[PDB]
């Protein structure tokens, strides 16, 4: 894979190669892939390879990353939640 | 995503944002999502977003969370198992 | 399972028994399995057991392994990406 606008990756604290869960609001598909850095400010959300069978252009998706952390950190950790407009620009 | 009554989250030792596996006894769907704290004592089990394609109102579900631990702790660790009545109240 | 030519395992830095995700470009199937070392230079990509229901001879596949690492190492780690010809030989 999934090509993500570098601005959304910074906003969401995602690294190139980080494992990402894509969930598709339109057809209910759920899959695991990894993040590729896309052209900054382009609003690109690109599905590459086998995933293109399940998740399609024009679909509304949620992109999720998880971390494994000790009980102590888990109770205090604040996730990065990024809301976007119809053109995949952060709000 | 899954909105869970804060009483069930306390009973099950689940944090807001903890990864949760939902399995549906009615249709056999299985998916991975995260826990959101719901109104305490409401008995709410709320499916939000893409998951609503697979898990429907009135379905019986099992909610599961896992922990990663060293061999020594794994042999002694006791999970929190929460039984609920028809109104999603703990027993 | 998945039997992989030992040359591709060395090239990709994969150990026998390492967890591997297979994604099928032809039919969109996605599954998690483990790597078995195949005859070196044979170009073998062998689907063993239950996976053969989903991934078939002649299918184009992407084989992926993930690592869990501390934030510091994650920002600097460089993944091993192996491109292969029609005969599953590295380029």
């Amino acid at each position: 894979x999934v090509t993500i606008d570098a601005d959304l990756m910074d906003a969401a604290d995602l690294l190139e190669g980080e494992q990402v869960t894509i969930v598709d609001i339109d057809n209910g598909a759920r899959l695991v892939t990894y993040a590729i850095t896309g052209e900054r400010g382009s609003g690109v959300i690109g599905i590459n390879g086998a995933a293109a069978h399940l998740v399609h252009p024009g679909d509304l998706v949620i992109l999720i990353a998880y971390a494994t952390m000790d009980d102590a950190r888990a109770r205090t950790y604040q996730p990065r939640i990024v809301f976007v407009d119809a053109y995949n620009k952060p709000i | 995503x899954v909105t869970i009554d804060a009483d069930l989250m306390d009973a099950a030792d689940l944090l807001e944002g903890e990864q949760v596996t939902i399995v549906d006894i009615d249709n056999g769907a299985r998916l991975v999502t995260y826990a959101i704290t719901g109104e305490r004592g409401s008995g709410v089990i709320g499916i939000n977003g893409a998951a609503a394609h697979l898990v429907h109102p009135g379905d019986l579900v099992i909610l599961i969370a896992y922990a990663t631990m060293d061999d020594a702790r794994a042999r002694t660790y006791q999970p929190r198992i929460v039984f609920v009545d028809a109104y999603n109240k703990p027993i | 399972x998945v039997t992989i030519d030992a040359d591709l395992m060395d090239a990709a830095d994969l150990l026998e028994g390492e967890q591997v995700t297979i994604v099928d470009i032809d039919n969109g199937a996605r599954l998690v399995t483990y790597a078995i070392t195949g005859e070196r230079g044979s170009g073998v990509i062998g689907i063993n057991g239950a996976a053969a229901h989903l991934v078939h001879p002649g299918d184009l596949v992407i084989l992926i392994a993930y690592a869990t690492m501390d934030d510091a190492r994650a920002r600097t780690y460089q993944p091993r990406i192996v491109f292969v010809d029609a005969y599953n030989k590295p380029i």
Binding site: D71 | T68 | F83
Partner: peptide
């Protein structure tokens, strides 16, 4: 004891393109 927690969420993004035969 390590828990798996939400770290990152991009909510209700629109898929802009797909390529079955991507190379990279």
């Amino acid at each position: 004891m390590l828990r798996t927690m939400l770290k990152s969420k991009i909510h209700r993004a629109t898929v802009t393109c797909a390529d079955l035969h991507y190379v990279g």
